[model samples]
Target: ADVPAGVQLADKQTLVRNNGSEVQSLDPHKIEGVPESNVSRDLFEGLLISDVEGHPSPGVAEKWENKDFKVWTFHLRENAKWSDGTPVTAHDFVYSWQRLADPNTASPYASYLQYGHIANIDDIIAGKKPATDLGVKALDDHTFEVTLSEPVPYFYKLLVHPSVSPVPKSAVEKFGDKWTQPANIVTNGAYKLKNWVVNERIVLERNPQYWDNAKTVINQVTYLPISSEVTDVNRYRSGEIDMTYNNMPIELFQKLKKEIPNEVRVDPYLCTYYYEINNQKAPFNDVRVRTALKLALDRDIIVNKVKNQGDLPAYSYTPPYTDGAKLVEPEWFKWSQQKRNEEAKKLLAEAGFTADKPLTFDLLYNTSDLHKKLAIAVASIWKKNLGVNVNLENQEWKTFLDTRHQGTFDVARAGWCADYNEPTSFLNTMLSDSSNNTAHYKSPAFDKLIADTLKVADDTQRSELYAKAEQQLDKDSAIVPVYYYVNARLVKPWVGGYTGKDPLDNIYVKNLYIIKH
Candidate 1:
């Protein structure tokens, strides 16, 4: 895991952090609702969980029986405990689910839980009925049950997520407004937050009360928030840090690869960096303008000159290996320059433009040298090829996010890293109605496609449907795919226990370790 340029960590736990620069609370209910859920799922326990391969498998509840698939019964492990030394019970699971769906809470990911086998949960959160009316129930102290609207193939895997973690009602009710603050934070995970200073460092210690603490390898861990690539490399070189994220500078990477080639690892990340057009906004509102802006750029130039970080030039927003399936590579990937030019001209004319009547647009970039170079290169290409004009606008990262969030732009660049190993993670974040939807883009047909995939039990069918949706999506010109990301990091050769890592950005450090002194 890499830190953002400036934001700091308050605390690191199973589901909440409380270092306190910001007012975010670590309540499991609140944690999963935020981006920090990456750190929260560990502090909490879900009913079912995933295996190392991101497949839904088992969790607190070892097994279940679907008598008729109407009243699904779940049997829990008797040894689970809360931070307060209270034995975890089925009621805790019921309470947590109810909390997420409560209309007063407003969890953004609530919609994600609505499809598949858990569709009814969304209605509860939307105020359609009491949470108790939902199908999940606590049959006894250690017994749980749920009735899904349908049989969901990925339901068990989703359970390992924080949305399904059981939380202690007593801790939340007792702490009230102070629930997520440092001294009051309580969790039931392999590690506990020992120290926190937002924007600086977060320290975690092995949980003494954890049921399987004996097997937990790392006793303590320190997470430093460093943004500068050189600084991170320096820390690693000085033996002050253990790893360098993808953001590491090119020079440091070359040095590391030369000095210790085995230390540098390559992994294909499930992320797609792309350009989003504001459909409702002027200039870009014209599909021809969007297509022209897309066709004008040279992805290779940006990858070689600017990023230098080895980011795969994304031609499609749905990265390869999305949901463990390969998408049909776009025909554009194979188009010759002459063919590309012809197609570009045809699309341009269709949108009422040509070389003589050049279209003009502005491309925004994050305030980085690489980004500025990319923006200029893209603008130059359009100017050279289609006789279009594009201006470059540089803004700070925070400002960039704020602008993107508000859908304020002629053409804006952005990226979506997968939250989980699901095609829906990318589609939902950028395309769904409740998603960021920076382009103000929507498609009822696309929505139906996504919904249909969730309902389809066959994995192959689901992938085909997603590919079709992506094709239609490409036709819309809402976004221009840049490339799918791959993991490129420098690690000390001595570092052990971190292997076969997920390129989709799983930062859970339960298994990372340094050589024993």
Candidate 2:
């Protein structure tokens, strides 16, 4: 495919569009999240990639051989090179893994990479040893060996991620502290970054040095970060943007879906949105108090009023369609008011609470209109069912994240969209330990369940164990499961080939092409 001439695209963030559909330029050492957050991956290559069906496919590394199940040898694509002319060698992969494991880097996702594969990775991330002391080694220019803590069936899928991509050491040496800065991101994948304005706009152009440029059909791509649902859809309507994703306001979808029927798109993604009660804090520390909070606001009411009938009520942390399994509804979804009331009373009695007891706590929430409605409904639930007075603390996006990280509130609203399609993508990431266990939740049994599941190679057994783990999560009331999320979008007829990738409104732009009439 030839590069389009004079291609100018404006997003809420970037004024000029650049290509990133195939892969991205920024170093994978510090990357995280899906295509929506990591534009670099869109234009650059990883060792493996998720195909159109969301299955893992071989990428830069054609294939790998497990020498002893603990150690595996990977041969890189000989044709691969960085935009700056550095070879994408096995040593690059070895160096990138070492850097992500470096104690100083403290990558948030280091645990996910380190857990099943890479022996002693947890200890290394825990600061027991330098990242270089870990087990990965480059045997030759194109060959590298990795020793895992145990056999991992999904290890190749893990490698398909940014954590394992070969990064440019020369770019780092040249740019120094400004390596990932907007002006200087180096490319190893199919495209190079052209313009970046931080949290606003970013642009990418094809890397002339990319080895697989022939496979990357697009020339340039643009990205704009539009957090507001209305603003995002408005740009699409104005013919200024190609697509908009993530929570496309419920109100806007209803008004526009019928008027612009051809533009609307809806899908059920394997994601969940739920509220959590701080089991470690006061008021919420009481199990009865937590039950009362859960029981108060009705899911049906909240889903309709707050989420605008667009999002499904999250009854469990793990969505039904996750891992392509049939949706299994949690028992709590069918819990009757009488049953919930009885459970609440017993829990309150165990905590020596009375209807007149002065129970007060703040429910922190994101200041979105839907979130506010949900918070208010929770307040109503506590006040009516338990006669407990609760305060609602609404804050903007950034402040909410800060306060939640600090564990400042009594109870808070939290939601997780799946990172991968697996059950552990929800279970291990959110409940296992210190990583995403935002409620400060920890359990020896929970850890044991996770560890045991990792050792089992059979998908059915692993899933059965995870089912027990999900039940355990509910039995302990560690997190209050609210609802799985559903999405609806608007796409113009001219915008051909844009398919919804994940249940979240994100798209894999590589498969998305324009049809000029």
Candidate 3:
């Protein structure tokens, strides 16, 4: 079959996608961000996997049973084999979770198990217990069990996360950090790493030994780490790409949607864009200064003028769409732009930053045109309203995340998406002990409030606690909530099995095929 008219394929059975940025790491235990998650889904098989529409389905685990939401047992399929032909045993999961929770590993998502209320996870992460004490057991080779400290209604949804994905312990011990490199990586997913050229492309070929390879039609996949959305669009129009990254040039959205309506895909993404402050630093350490910066943001202009791609302005951290989470409005949230600017000016003055002694800091963002636009607009707002001096700094995605993680920037652009459909996906990162807490916004009251939610069984009570956490963010200016995200991108015509119904937009090539005519 010949390729379709404006479609590009690595081969007749291959698919190409723009992955937005170079992947930070292939080690699921240590990576963060959507770009990394995109590649991880192809390279690793978790206990459970999300289907095309975002429902949990069997991956390595063929079935599972739970004891009143406290104890869960997973039944792994015997045919699940790693790329190197090693049996994917239940012990792999036991070791992966322990390594992830280990302090020396320093995985940013280490607190993930605590959110599940996994037994001893709290104490283990608190350094009061050893990593060996985690509450997981391999009952024989195919059966895996986990015990939780409390009842969790959304526990199964959490298993789909790659953080708990199994890793080959023997390979890791032999190769150390090199185990994840393209030459040494042994993955159990439908796809395995074929070639990797830094800053250019990472190619994947179908794993012939995959348990479900009979239905895996796509022979190979190529991911381009093209940072520019405009370049992605240009490549897509010229028949050199299959799909674009989750964002596009906002100025061209209307025109592109009208020009190629069938290829244009807009998804309701479950993500929030904000600015993370260095709470341990001098200028922003003061609550008055943080709140002043938060108040000066005009989200309306950002969503309406700068990003008119069906995004909404966000006043609070968690979006209203999060399941079982309610959006609570603060008194200041209802204030007009003029009123907010006036209050911001007063707060900055109280913090000892004046017109003569202006608050100056560099705002860091990744190398994206839209991010740059937002940074420019926000800097202009702060300068015009509060006599603040703001500088913009940009870095590539991989280096950008390292900068944010190491606290090297005064303030940096941050975006978060729900790891699960629940409210905890957004709220848990603010905990004092969360490794993903880049801002270092620690509050005893806030920590206790979120932790207490795990104990409550009633939906009403859990949401009430969730509401308080959001309120606490407003009080402390934990992070500046700028806007909710909409995933507006482009896809080719001859690709099949694409669905944006899942809020996370978790698309796996295993579920896709080349629709050759």
Predictions in order: lDDT: 0.64, 0.65, 0.87
Model 2: number of backbone collisions: 23
lDDT of candidate 1 over 21-108, digit per residue (tens) = 2213356665422235545644666776544444555567878777543456788888777666778789888887777767676654
What 10-residue stretch in candidate 1 is worst by lDDT? 14-23
Q: Pick the candidate with the highest TM-score.
A: 3
Error of 1 at 155 (Å): 1.7
lDDT of 3 by residue, 69-173 (tens): 999999999999999888898999999889988888888888898888789987887789999999999998999999998888789899888898888898799
Q: Give candidate 2 regions above 4 Å deviation.
A: 1-36, 67-70, 173-177, 308-310, 324-330, 345-358, 366-370, 373-399, 501-506
**Evaluated with lDDT, which candidate comes out highest?**
3
lDDT of 2 by residue, 1-517 (tens): 2224654322221222222121222456544444324575655576666655556766677778885467777777788778877777888777888877777865556766555458768778778888887788888888878888788765665555566666667667798657876567677766687877755677777778877666555566677655556666777778776666445665576778678877677777777766776667776665566665565546776677655646776656788777734335566568876676666656666777776665677878865545666677767866776666778887755566557656787778877766666777777765444455667666677777767886777788788778777767766677666777775656656454445664533343454445453
lDDT of 1 at 415: 64
Which scores greater on TM-score, model 1 or model 3?
3
Model 2 residue 84 lDDT score: 77
- Root-mean-square deviation (CA) per prediction: 6.2, 4.7, 2.8
TM-score of 2: 0.85
